[PDB]
Amino acid sequence: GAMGSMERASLIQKAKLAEQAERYEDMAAFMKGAVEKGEELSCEERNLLSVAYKNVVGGQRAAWRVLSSIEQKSNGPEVREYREKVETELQGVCDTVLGLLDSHLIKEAGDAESRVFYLKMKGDYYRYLAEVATGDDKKRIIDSARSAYQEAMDISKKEMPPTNPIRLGLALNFSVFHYEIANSPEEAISLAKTTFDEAMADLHTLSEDSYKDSTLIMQLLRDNLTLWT
């Protein structure tokens, strides 16, 4: 890898600088290099990895949606060609992230906090693959996302309180999966509502700072329920 000659600590330091500079492709490359050093990642480091690739794939997804809309209205080869170019680049980013999770972040994650984080990410990047999928692998892509999300949910329910922000963000994203990928809007609504209500009943156990963390994500669940009902 092009980051193989850089110290792990220097890659983490530069990922943080890239974040401040809004240089998210650089941030992702640095965090990919850090992962490939082979050591487990800390909570802060997991967050840096997630933020970097969230921003990279987020720009690609937003571009793909613009182009797909234009392509739909048009229905020369240029619009299809350019949508395909963006799609292929997006798929490549998703494959890279899934490859980091499979080689070997997930198997070495021997804490619920780390394992749930990575399994949520696996569901997220299969979900992004599913958003653009159409051919003979779409159904398998969807099932791979569902399986990763479900294993993460099972662990999080056993090992984390209902206000834990990783658990809340997992349930939020699994609900979005149900609503717009799996065509299961009632599952999506049920999951968001149960997650919201169980977190509410646990808020009394929290410090002021944890309360702010949890209620921030609860608000996203609430806004989705308002949109969907």
């Binding site: 969230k54 609503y179 717009e180 996203l220």
Partner: peptide, 8 residues
């Protein structure tokens, strides 16, 4: 547009 965790 619906929210997912990454866009808080």
């Amino acid at each position: 547009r619906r929210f997912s965790a990454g866009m808080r």
